[PDB]
Structures are given as structure tokens and as C-alpha cells.
UniProtKB/TrEMBL annotation, chain A:
Protein name listed in UniProt: Envelope glycoprotein gp160
Note: HIV-1 lineages are divided in three main groups, M (for Major), O (for Outlier), and N (for New, or Non-M, Non-O). The vast majority of strains found worldwide belong to the group M. Group O seems to be endemic to and largely confined to Cameroon and neighboring countries in West Central Africa, where these viruses represent a small minority of HIV-1 strains. The group N is represented by a limited number of isolates from Cameroonian persons. The group M is further subdivided in 9 clades or subtypes (A to D, F to H, J and K). Inhibitors targeting HIV-1 viral envelope proteins are used as antiretroviral drugs. Attachment of virions to the cell surface via non-specific interactions and CD4 binding can be blocked by inhibitors that include cyanovirin-N, cyclotriazadisulfonamide analogs, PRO 2000, TNX 355 and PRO 542. In addition, BMS 806 can block CD4-induced conformational changes. Env interactions with the coreceptor molecules can be targeted by CCR5 antagonists including SCH-D, maraviroc (UK 427857) and aplaviroc (GW 873140), and the CXCR4 antagonist AMD 070.
Family: Belongs to the HIV-1 env protein family.
Subunit structure: The mature envelope protein (Env) consists of a homotrimer of non-covalently associated gp120-gp41 heterodimers. The resulting complex protrudes from the virus surface as a spike. There seems to be as few as 10 spikes on the average virion. Surface protein gp120 interacts with host CD4, CCR5 and CXCR4. Gp120 also interacts with the C-type lectins CD209/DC-SIGN and CLEC4M/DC-SIGNR (collectively referred to as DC-SIGN(R)). Gp120 and gp41 interact with GalCer.
Function: Envelope glycoprotein gp160: Oligomerizes in the host endoplasmic reticulum into predominantly trimers. In a second time, gp160 transits in the host Golgi, where glycosylation is completed. The precursor is then proteolytically cleaved in the trans-Golgi and thereby activated by cellular furin or furin-like proteases to produce gp120 and gp41.
Protein modification: Palmitoylation of the transmembrane protein and of Env polyprotein (prior to its proteolytic cleavage) is essential for their association with host cell membrane lipid rafts. Palmitoylation is therefore required for envelope trafficking to classical lipid rafts, but not for viral replication. Highly glycosylated by host. The high number of glycan on the protein is reffered to as 'glycan shield' because it contributes to hide protein sequence from adaptive immune system.
Subcellular compartments: Host cell membrane; Host endosome membrane; Virion membrane
The gene coding this protein: env
Residues of the full protein shown: 247 to 295 of 846
Domain of life (superkingdom): Viruses
Domain notes: The CD4-binding region is targeted by the antibody b12.
Signal peptide: none
Length: 49, 210, 220
């Protein structure tokens, strides 16, 4: 999950409480981790009419 | 691992009477038990879900109640169409099933007619021998059949096949064999089928001298 | 109009692979999870695995881990299961079924396919060897019959007097012996007044091997 808000306190894990056979576990962090990405090559754009 | 078991393995019910079956778990699966009905020869259907809620399309005669580690299924006025295999399933953890139980029709207990067919000419010409013991209309489906050769007992060399309960007369048929080569058949003179039943005051033996 | 459709399968040699599948409709394919289960005659039920046709990923019981794989195709509304390294232990009827819940967690279901068989055997094929069974000679009643051995694969269909004798007849299921081949047992109970005075015919059609065999019985 990226660019979103952070949890006010500690990490909160949200889940369903009926059965343990669940589809999604959502982990909401209280601190962000920065990720840096790049595509290092340089492309020329062309155009075909 | 969720461990589920069931009891009795076989229930005997007089049609028109209510019937009960139960399931037990080693863990807590309290939020979600379910029961299924299996027809011989066909895919099963859901009867009870959410522990005690009837599945859509299920008649009011089908019910049950429980929680935690124990639950009982009840069918009011059990009808002939309701004799089936029933199973328990748990949804609180990775899905597992119990072994399952079956309900059989209760009938008057009685001994079978007992017949013997010594090996015929064609199987003996072919090189084998199979002595056939036929038991007709014994009830319940629980009996002992053993084979003798010149009064000696044999084991490890026999076959047995039993039919499904007859939906019309609630009865059974049993067929079993004494198996050996024609060469072994020729080693003895009297072949016999001896049977013991709760419907018999004494053992019944049929035999043939070859 | 929710329906599930399955294809059948042959008998494979040990070490062979099998592919089975299930088509389904009456509900959007990508809106629900599908399950595969297994049961063998005389045994209980086991869960094998789950596939999410929306994407998607799979999860399997450790029991089949490394032998079972699953795929999906959203353009045909189908799911496929494949089993490698088959053994006789896997002789079973396989089922495919639709799950329940879109809300966040899964429970269980009421829409099951018919069941498809997969068998595994070292045996190739055999026609039946059929022998008559009859008493030597009243007794009031007696049964006449037939014994069929060493056929493969099953079923073999038995009838009496070419379809004319439909009552008093008792049949047993196909049974395997140590040879890996199957046997059949069939008898008909008749009054002695209709036996010492008549003859009866056991007719067995082994459709899978394209052959038919029959034998005559009387209380010799
Ligand atoms: C409906 C239900 O079972 N509620 C329980 C809740 O009481 C418990 O605090 C939580 C953590 O174990 O799991 C869930
Ligand atoms: C503390 C944190 O999450 N880090 C920053 C967030 O302030 C800023 O949003 C974002 C650029 O959007 O860079 C990151």
C-alpha cells in the first residue's frame, strides 16, 4: 500500500473475526518506509502516422 | 489440524421415527459447523450451515443444535428418502471433514437361506476353482462366513461381496468364495460353507463331495 | 441456473499424469473461489486445494504438495487440476465445487459437480472369463448363477435371459482381486418346479472391451 496515511499509534493489523479462513489481512504501519525506484536507461520516442 | 469425529458409525432407524446423529471436535469450531447429505451414486447436498441454520430448500423435518466441541443433528419422522450418509464439516480453521456416519433401515432380524455352488466344469477346465456360498435375506448386515476343506479351516484365500440394503424390502444378499487352483481343488473331497448369524440357533453348513 | 460440468478420465499407469477439469456457469466466474476435494470408495473425505479464478493464486494441502497443480482460464469459465506421479492410492472420485462468500472471509458451499473418476492401475485390459454356476441334482427353491472373473476395466453389465429375466435376480458390485483384475457375481432365485424343468442364461456385456459372453445354467 503506498502514499497513504499512517497509523497514529503503533502498527495496526485489521482482519475479520468470524473464522480464521480469511481472504485479506491488512497491515497499516505507523511509520513509512521510503522506496526509491528508477528506470536508468534513456529512450527515444518515435511516431508512426 | 482440526480433528472431527462422528458417532454412531451406523444408526438403525425404524421409518417414521425421529433419528439422531452427533459430531465431536478436539478444538473449538463454535462459530461454524455444517452438515451434508450424501446419496449413493450422486454428489452431496448441504443441509445445515451456521451450526443450526437450515439450507435453502431443506424441509422442516431437518434440524439440530450445538456449539463449541459438540453438535447433534435430528431428523423428525425419518422417511425412506432420508436414509443417507451424513457428514460434519468445520469452517473455523483450514477446512477438514469428519469420517461420516450412515443411517440404515431397521428390520426384523432373520437367518438367510444358505446355498452352495461347487466349482463348475468350465472353471475347472480353465484351471481355477471357486466354490460359491450364497446367503439370501439375512438381516442385519453383520455375519460370519468361513470355509472348510475336509473339515480343515482355511484363511487368506477367499472373497466376499455384499449388496447395498434393498430400498424395497430392507434386506441384504451376500456372496463369497473359496479360492484355489483346480490343482488344489483336486486335493480335497468335501468343500463346505459354514455360517454363523445372530438369526441362527445353530451354525449352518452346506457342502459338496468331489 | 448454477451448474458445474466435469469430464471423465481413463485408468493411468503408475507414475503417469492425469488432467481433470470443471466448467461452471450461472454466476460470474471471477467472482468466487473454487475447491477441489477427494474421496475414495470406503474412505472419508479430504480437502486438496483452492484456486482463485479472479487472478490468481492457489493454496494446497501439504498432502499433495508438489504433486498437484492448478490453473484457470477466465475466457472459458473453467478450472483445471493436474496430478503428477500417480499411484493406486489416488484411485478416487474427484469433485469440484463453488465456494461461498465475497465479503472478506470464506465459509462453505452447496454447488457441487457430479464427480469424476480417475483410476490408476498396472493392468491394461481383459475381457471377462465367464463360468456358469448351478446345483447338482428339490429343496423348494434354489438359485442359478454365473461367475465372472479377471475383466478390466469395469463395469461389466449383467442381465438374464437377454433382458427377459428381470426379477428374482441379485447382483454384486465389481470387486478387485490381487491380480488387479475385477470379478462379478450374479444369481437368480427360482422355485425348483421352474428349475428342474427349465434352463436359464447369464448374459454379461463388457462394453469397455467391446465383447459379450454368456453361459447356460440348470440344476444338473
Ligand atoms: C466475535 C469474536 O470471536 N470476537 C473475538 C474477540 O473477542 C477477540 O478479542 C479477538 C482477538 O482474539 O478475536 C475475535
Ligand atoms: C514521512 C513519510 O511518509 N514520508 C514522506 C511523505 O511525507 C511525503 O509524502 C512523501 C512524498 O509524498 O514522501 C514521503
Amino acid at each position: 500500500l503506498l502514499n497513504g496515511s499512517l497509523a497514529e499509534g503503533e502498527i495496526i493489523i485489521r482482519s475479520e473475526n468470524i473464522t480464521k479462513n480469511v481472504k485479506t489481512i491488512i497491515v497499516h504501519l505507523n511509520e513509512s518506509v521510503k522506496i526509491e525506484c528508477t528506470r536508468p536507461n534513456n529512450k527515444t520516442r518515435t511516431s508512426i502516422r | 489440524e482440526i480433528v472431527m469425529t462422528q458417532s454412531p458409525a451406523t444408526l438403525s432407524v425404524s421409518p417414521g421415527e425421529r433419528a439422531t446423529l452427533s459430531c465431536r471436535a478436539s478444538q473449538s469450531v463454535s462459530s461454524n459447523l455444517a452438515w451434508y447429505q450424501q446419496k449413493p451414486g450422486q454428489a452431496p447436498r448441504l443441509l445445515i450451515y451456521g451450526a443450526s441454520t437450515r439450507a435453502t430448500g431443506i424441509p422442516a423435518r431437518f434440524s439440530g443444535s450445538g456449539s463449541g466441541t459438540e453438535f447433534t443433528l435430528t431428523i423428525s419422522s425419518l422417511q425412506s428418502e432420508d436414509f443417507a450418509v451424513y457428514y460434519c464439516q468445520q469452517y473455523n480453521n483450514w477446512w477438514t471433514f469428519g469420517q461420516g456416519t450412515k443411517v440404515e433401515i431397521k428390520r426384523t432380524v432373520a437367518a438367510p437361506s444358505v446355498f452352495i455352488f461347487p466349482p463348475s466344469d468350465e472353471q475347472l477346465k480353465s484351471g481355477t476353482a471357486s466354490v460359491v456360498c450364497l446367503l439370501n435375506n439375512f438381516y442385519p448386515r453383520e455375519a460370519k462366513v468361513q470355509w472348510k476343506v475336509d473339515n480343515a479351516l482355511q484363511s487368506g484365500n477367499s472373497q466376499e461381496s455384499v449388496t447395498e440394503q434393498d430400498s424395497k424390502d430392507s434386506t441384504y444378499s451376500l456372496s463369497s468364495t473359496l479360492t484355489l487352483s483346480k490343482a488344489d481343488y483336486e486335493k480335497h473331497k468335501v468343500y463346505a460353507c459354514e455360517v454363523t448369524h445372530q438369526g441362527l440357533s445353530s451354525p449352518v453348513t452346506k457342502s459338496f463331495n468331489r | 441456473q448454477v451448474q458445474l460440468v466435469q469430464s471423465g478420465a481413463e485408468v493411468k499407469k503408475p507414475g503417469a499424469s492425469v488432467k481433470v477439469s470443471c466448467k461452471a456457469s450461472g454466476y460470474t466466474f471471477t467472482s468466487y473461489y473454487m475447491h477441489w476435494v477427494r474421496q475414495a470408495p470406503g474412505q472419508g473425505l479430504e480437502w486438496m486445494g483452492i484456486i482463485n479464478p479472479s487472478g490468481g493464486s492457489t493454496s494446497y494441502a501439504q498432502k499433495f504438495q508438489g504433486r498437484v497443480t492448478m490453473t484457470r482460464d477466465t475466457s472459458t469459465s473453467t478450472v483445471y487440476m493436474e496430478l503428477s506421479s500417480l499411484r493406486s492410492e489416488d484411485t478416487a472420485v474427484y469433485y469440484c465445487a463453488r465456494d461461498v462468500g465475497t465479503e472478506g472471509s470464506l465459509l462453505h458451499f452447496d454447488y457441487w459437480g457430479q464427480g469424476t473418476l480417475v483410476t490408476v492401475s498396472s493392468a491394461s485390459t481383459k475381457g471377462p472369463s465367464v463360468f456358469p454356476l448351478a446345483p447338482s441334482s428339490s429343496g423348494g427353491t434354489a438359485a442359478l448363477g454365473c461367475l465372472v472373473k479377471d475383466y478390466f476395466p469395469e463395469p461389466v453389465t449383467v442381465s438374464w435371459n437377454s433382458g427377459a429375466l428381470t426379477s428374482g435376480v441379485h447382483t454384486f458390485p465389481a470387486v478387485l482381486q490381487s491380480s488387479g483384475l475385477y470379478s462379478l457375481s450374479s444369481v437368480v432365485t427360482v422355485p425348483s418346479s421352474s428349475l428342474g424343468t427349465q434352463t436359464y442364461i447369464c448374459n454379461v456385456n463388457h462394453k469397455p472391451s467391446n465383447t459379450k459372453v454368456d453361459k447356460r445354467v440348470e440344476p444338473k
